[PDB]
Every structure is written in structure tokens, then in C-alpha cells.
Amino acid sequence: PQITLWKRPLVTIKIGGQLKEALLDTGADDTIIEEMSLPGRWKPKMIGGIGGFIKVRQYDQIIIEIAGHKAIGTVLVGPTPVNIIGRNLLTQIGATLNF
Amino acid sequence: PQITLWKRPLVTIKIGGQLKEALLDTGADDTIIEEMSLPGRWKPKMIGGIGGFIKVRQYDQIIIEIAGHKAIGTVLVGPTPVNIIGRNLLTQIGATLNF
Ligand SMILES: CC(C)CN(C[C@@H](O)[C@H](Cc1ccccc1)NC(=O)O[C@H]1CCOC1)S(=O)(=O)c1ccc(N)cc1
Ligand SMILES: [Cl-]
Numbered sequence: 379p380q381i382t383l384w385k386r387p388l389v390t391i392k393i394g395g396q397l398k399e400a401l402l403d404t405g406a407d408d409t410i411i412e413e414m415s416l417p418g419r420w421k422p423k424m425i426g427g428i429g430g431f432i433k434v435r436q437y438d439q440i441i442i443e444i445a446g447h448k449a450i451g452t453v454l455v456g457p458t459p460v461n462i463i464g465r466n467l468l469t470q471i472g473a474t475l476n477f
Numbered sequence: 478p479q480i481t482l483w484k485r486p487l488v489t490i491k492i493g494g495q496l497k498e499a500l501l502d503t504g505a506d507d508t509i510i511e512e513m514s515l516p517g518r519w520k521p522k523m524i525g526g527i528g529g530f531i532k533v534r535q536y537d538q539i540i541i542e543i544a545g546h547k548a549i550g551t552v553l554v555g556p557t558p559v560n561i562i563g564r565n566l567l568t569q570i571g572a573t574l575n576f
């Protein structure tokens with residue numbers, strides 16, 4: 379698609395066999411989702427946002443579909459206002475900003 | 478142009494006579510710039526996200542040259558860790574996310 383920005387760029391994602399809503403966020407280095415069960419081991423990560431830095435859980439090589447596009451990569455889990463698809467997975471699905 | 482997302486999508490902006498570097502951020506509803514003076518009236522606002530909320534000043538009807546493209550709209554000013562061009566001004570320069 380070509381997505382304009384008059385409203386929030388919200389899409390459906392599928393993770394763990396469940397559909398969720400997520401924000402496509404070019405200002406997010408990383409993908410972070412609200413608390414849920416993911417398989418495997420996790421590692422600690424510090425991420426920075428508007429209010430400061432927080433520690434979150436990092437899961438690697440997670441299968442995730444984004445607006446129908448398949449990705450496999452790093453998903454963080456932690457306190458987040460919305461599920462966020464950031465540049466690590468935006469790049470995998472071939473997203474660019476154009477003007 | 479067409480901007481990939483392998484690295485942060487940073488551009489040069491001009492605002493209030495000053496050149497700054499800013500992130501083109503599809504996840505940000507409104508544009509937020511680090512502390513600077515702007516002309517006219519303002520009102521206080523709180524904005525939040527990862528790491529919580531910050532208090533900002535909301536200035537309306539501010540012109541900003543973004544990578545060569547002029548746009549007018551609301552500009553928030555406050556202790557953001559990064560200058561962010563949000564959707565309110567991305568729309569005006571015809572920015573889209575494509576994949
Ligand atoms: C969290 C989203 C929903 C909203 N933010 C936008 C995001 O793009 C935000 C931008 C940013 C980059 C680096 C440092 C600080 C902020 N990135 C962000 O948190 O990246 C984290 C999430 C995973 O990767 C790392 S916001 O800054 O809170 C915000 C809120 C309101 C307005 N008007 C403007 C900005
Ligand atoms: Cl990744």
C-alpha cells in the first residue's frame with residue numbers, strides 16, 4: 379500500500395496466531411508489543427522514548443505478519459501505549475517514506 | 478525523495494530562523510522540537526509515550542521548512558530527546574509510507 383498520514387497508520391498484525399492492531403512507526407528503532415506470551419528465551423534491553431529510558435524483554439527471531447507481509451525478527455515486550463512496528467521490521471517488509 | 482528505514486529518517490529543517498536535524502516520525506501525532514523560542518501565543522500540553530509524559534508548550538500556525546518543503550501547523554516545544562516531525566506536518570509535505 380501507499381499509506382497517508384491524516385490518521386494514525388494502524389494495521390493488523392498477526393503474532394502467536396492472534397490478530398492485534400499496531401502502529402507503523404518510523405520514529406521507533408525497534409518493534410515493541412504489549413504484554414503477551416512469546417516462545418523462547420529473552421534478553422534484557424534498554425529503549426528510549428519521549429519520557430526517558432525503560433527496560434524491556436527482547437525476543438529474537440519471532441514470526442510476525444504485518445498487514446499481510448511476513449517478517450521474522452526481534453520483538454520487544456514491555457509497557458507501551460500501543461503495539462509499535464518499528465524500523466527493524468519496517469525494513470524487512472520493504473517500507474519506505476516518500477514525499 | 479524515497480527514504481529507506483535502515484537508519485533513522487533524519488532530515489534538516491528550518492524553524493524560527495534556525496536549522497535543526499529532525500526525525501520523520503509516522504508514529505508521532507504532532508511535531509515536537511527541543512527547547513527554543515517561537516513567536517506568539519502558546520498553551521501548555523502533556524504528551525507521552527515510552528518512558529512516560531513530558532510537559533510542552535503548544536504553538537499554533539508555525540511555519541517549518543522540512544527538507545525543502547514548507548508546511549504550517551502546530552509545533553510543540555519541550556524536553557524531547559529528539560526533534561520530531563509528526564503527522565500533522567508530514568501530511569502537508571505529502572509524505573506517505575509505501576510497501
Ligand atoms: C510511542 C509513540 C506512540 C509516540 N512517540 C513517537 C515515537 O516514534 C518515538 C519517537 C522518539 C524517538 C527517540 C526518542 C524519543 C522519541 N519512538 C519511540 O518511542 O521509540 C521507541 C519505541 C520502540 O523503539 C524505540 S512519542 O515520541 O511518545 C510522541 C508522542 C506524542 C507526540 N505528539 C509526539 C511524539
Ligand atoms: Cl530484527
Ligand SMILES: [Cl-]
Binds near residue numbers: 549550551565566
Ligand atoms: Cl497542525
Ligand SMILES: [Cl-]
Binds near residue numbers: 382571
Ligand atoms: Cl493526501
Ligand code: NA
Binds near residue numbers: 516517518536537538
Ligand atoms: Na501562533
